[PDB]
Design a binder for this molecule. Structure first.
Ligand SMILES: NCCCC[C@H](N)C(=O)NS(=O)(=O)OC[C@H]1O[C@@H](n2cnc3c(N)ncnc32)[C@H](O)[C@@H]1O
Ligand SMILES: NCCCC[C@H](N)C(=O)NS(=O)(=O)OC[C@H]1O[C@@H](n2cnc3c(N)ncnc32)[C@H](O)[C@@H]1O
Lengths: 506, 506
């Protein structure tokens, strides 16, 4: 029957394309007022009151149609996230000889334009009225050839996102919220005289993060190229150039598997501020995010539901300042009740045995290669799993942070922090390593990590090294995951529901 | 000697990293006031007047250093696009025993922080004074290991953009202007209740334009994918979903050669508005662009210098409304003094012979394949080459516009326009083709164009065709080249000077 409806409506519309008495695909319809403005402009009307002088013209998609008798029909239009009811008595219709022929063509799902006047209906059985258009003329703008469903399934909603947006309206709101998150961040940085810049997405070396890149080829120059995994190395060059405050909100490309917090392409905001350090960035972060949550949510506290198998599970995310701050190695010592190496020894093979002994005793599986950086990163997860409120984890070792500046007092650690919300990492920031001598050392250490099997290690970029030799000022850098911010502010348990068209496993 | 300077400064700084008496790479310096704010706050000072009570602390890069005698030195700092002079008498220096040792370490090009008070110098020979910092303490923040040049060359500036920004400051301004163009467009659309969205950059089918795409591979899913050449087909699906007004400012990827108006990756703004048509878009375009030019330039008229071999050549770009409007085929008939086919016959092989006869008689070389769409596109160039002011070219044929809606009165043409400025195409817009029956026809016609050798033809996307069957309202679509807008508003004769890091021919 769905196939029968599609074939019947197709032949009907196809005939109208030849005959053009209704002209099923007209060019222009003049909308006098949007549906939301319509409902707000005339909400003051009392139940039963009408203004026949107030002529309007609106448009939208038919979501409901009912007809009682032959001289009365009702419609419900969806438009701009608002539902508007139409009432078409025959005494209100201009040209009553066209009344029945104009209506019989309209089916549920069609885009229609309608003219008429304003009034609030008076139900005999339910009361409270409804601001409606008292139809004088109705006109088909675009016919819907398919029968719309009466649709829970998840991964069909991702291939036909447009159908999801038609049927739910719940999806529509969270993508608007995602837009508002991005515009809040731009406002925050623009007001601080940041310059919005754009750096290449196709590079000969993909640096600035630890990830596997996408590869492509430019035919005209017979040149293989990597899709960028981060804009970091370019943005620091701009700061070397004199652009003291830059930021970029764009797409990243990382060749990794899909899960509830990972997409092969995703949006991240990175900003760089000269003459600031981590402690400036820590105050910037919790000022920006706490006040963003209150402005968008209405409260400093969010109720998040992480488990899709148990929607009753409720987490309470308190973004109130000050945020909890913890030192990584200090708390790792408390988690496992053991004194860790000094910190300048965290790269040694003796430390590697120490880390693996903790992993196998606690039955924590670390996928190979078992470099000290990866093994420790797995151990840090035991800290992340109790960070519900936004929590700073500070003091990453140097073997894990090839581009973060060494700590001014703690020997083997870096001035670096990550923020975790509901156990997920939402942003990464540190004091920019502006020391070309130490930078070379970190790049050599990464090269040795790749020698033991870590293909995602960050090897040296000599142009970036040249910029550090000309001089990068003391600056602070910062990067966040926009998609993950959208998850927690829209109460989405998966990243595939804050992405309009998520990467499809075909 | 440049190598000798780099090796000498390296050994010197390397020693300071061990000794740490100066500590060549300190962590944090507290800037009391930015250099531009400094020059504006104290510009009221008269020549010779000082305020020893007003203590400041600023930072920047040394661009000039002079020393007269042993107790007086001058510096000139560059910061935030502003140049500030430092005066360091020994009577002003706190701890005079450190005065000479603190200064001798500083070389031209170093990032330094400086403290002192405010005053305007009084030159005995040149007058007019200069608001200066009367130094009490100077401190090295980042040493510059390389000798800066005394630098015209072009393509070395693209590989070391940071060096370009250090030496010129002329480059710095046009990238700020480019930022202001993007933010003007966002303001224009945001004020009209547009939603800023993001659509995939990695698709299984790259549609929405006529171009050759980049190909890549996702390992986890063993899946080949195309980098997007346009977001159009996704944005129309959002309008089918109920997002009546959407826009996206992001990167496009087209595998084509580099020239003065083409980069393999470039930024384009596309917006889609339901219930509007070309004539709405034409007024939107010349309202947005004319008022953007006046707000950013200060005038409705721009002086553009297109030829790099002849910088004296000056074009006058008048963005005043109304803009000139011309019909494509109507003016092509006047250009060649010949009546063109009816328009519904422009796809036929008889028309193909007609087009080639014009091309070979006028010695216009069209690279194969010689499809009617390509041959006509070459002929249209003869119109483009006299469009100095922003000019609409309206009425493209259907064989050239597979996604533009057919004209309501002109049989074989589409409601489509392109805007040309100084003979270059800056934007492309039309009435969205919301007719799935005719859309299939256009996709079949493109498939036949590919059969005759046009590998860039737009073949069918069946998911997008499904969305049109559910119903796309009558909408108008619009797309512009941000990089090309930046060229004309910054007086840049090549696209590689409005791109921070342009694609490098290695
Ligand atoms: N100089 C200071 C550091 C700047 C940030 C650094 N360049 C960077 O790339 N950070 S990152 O940790 O690699 O990623 C940034 C954030 O993006 C998010 N992210 C990372 N990978 C993904 C994926 N795959 N999908 C979605 N979001 C992701 C996550 O919240 C991260 O904290
Ligand atoms: N539905 C209305 C039409 C929307 C626009 C359509 N999707 C589109 O892609 N237009 S385009 O003509 O293919 O490109 C848009 C603009 O981008 C610019 N452009 C195109 N190719 C390049 C390249 N290679 N570099 C820089 N700028 C470029 C140029 O000004 C074009 O007018």
């Amino acid at each position: 029957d769905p196939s029968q409806y599609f074939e019947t409506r197709s032949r009907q519309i196809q005939e109208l394309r030849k005959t053009h008495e209704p002209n099923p695909y007209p060019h222009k319809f003049h909308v006098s007022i949007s549906n939301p403005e319509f409902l707000a402009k005339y909400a003051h009307l009392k139940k039963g009151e009408t203004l026949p002088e107030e002529k309007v013209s609106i448009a939208g998609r038919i979501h409901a149609k009912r007809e009682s008798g032959s001289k009365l029909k009702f419609y419900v239009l969806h438009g701009d996230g608002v539902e508007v009811q139409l009432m078409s008595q025959l005494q209100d219709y201009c040209d009553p000889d066209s009344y029945e022929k104009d209506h019989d063509l309209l089916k549920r799902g069609d885009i229609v334009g309608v003219e008429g006047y304003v009034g609030r209906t008076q139900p005999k059985k339910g009361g409270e009225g409804e601001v409606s258009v008292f139809v004088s003329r109705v006109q088909l703008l675009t016919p819907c050839l398919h029968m719309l469903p009466a649709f829970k399934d998840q991964e069909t909603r991702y291939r036909k996102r447009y159908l999801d947006l038609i049927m739910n309206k719940d999806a529509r709101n969270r993508f608007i919220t995602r837009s508002e998150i991005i515009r809040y961040i731009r406002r925050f940085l623009d007001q601080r005289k940041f310059i919005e810049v754009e750096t290449p997405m196709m590079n000969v070396i993909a640096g600035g993060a630890t990830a596997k890149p996408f590869i492509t080829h430019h035919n005209d120059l017979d040149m293989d190229m990597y899709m960028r995994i981060a804009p970091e190395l370019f943005l620091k060059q701009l700061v070397v150039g004199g652009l003291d405050r830059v930021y970029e909100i764009g797409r990243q490309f990382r060749n990794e598997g899909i899960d509830m917090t990972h997409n092969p392409e995703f949006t991240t905001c990175e900003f760089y501020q000269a003459y600031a350090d981590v402690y400036d960035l820590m105050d910037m972060t919790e000022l920006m995010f706490s006040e963003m949550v209150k402005e968008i949510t209405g409260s400093y506290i969010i109720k998040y539901h992480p488990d899709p198998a148990d929607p009753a599970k409720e987490l309470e995310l308190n973004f109130s300042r000050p945020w909890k701050r913890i030192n990584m190695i200090e708390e790792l010592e408390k988690v496992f009740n053991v004194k860790f190496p000094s910190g300048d020894q965290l790269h040694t093979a003796e430390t590697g045995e120490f880390l693996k002994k903790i992993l196998v005793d606690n039955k924590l599986e670390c996928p190979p290669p078992l470099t000290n950086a990866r093994m420790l990163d797995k151990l840090v997860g035991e800290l992340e799993d109790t960070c519900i409120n936004p929590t700073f984890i500070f003091g990453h070792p140097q073997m894990m942070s090839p581009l973060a500046k060494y700590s001014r007092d703690q020997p083997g650690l870096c001035e670096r922090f990550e923020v975790f919300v509901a156990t997920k990492e939402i942003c990464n920031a540190y004091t920019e390593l502006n020391d070309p001598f130490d930078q070379r050392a970190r790049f050599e250490e990464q090269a040795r990590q790749k020698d033991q099997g870590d293909d995602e290690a960050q090897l040296v970029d000599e142009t970036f090294c040249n910029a550090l030799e000309y001089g990068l000022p003391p600056t602070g850098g910062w990067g966040c995951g926009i998609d993950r911010l959208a998850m927690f502010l829209t109460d989405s348990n998966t990243i595939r529901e804050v992405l309009l068209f998520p990467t499809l496993k075909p």
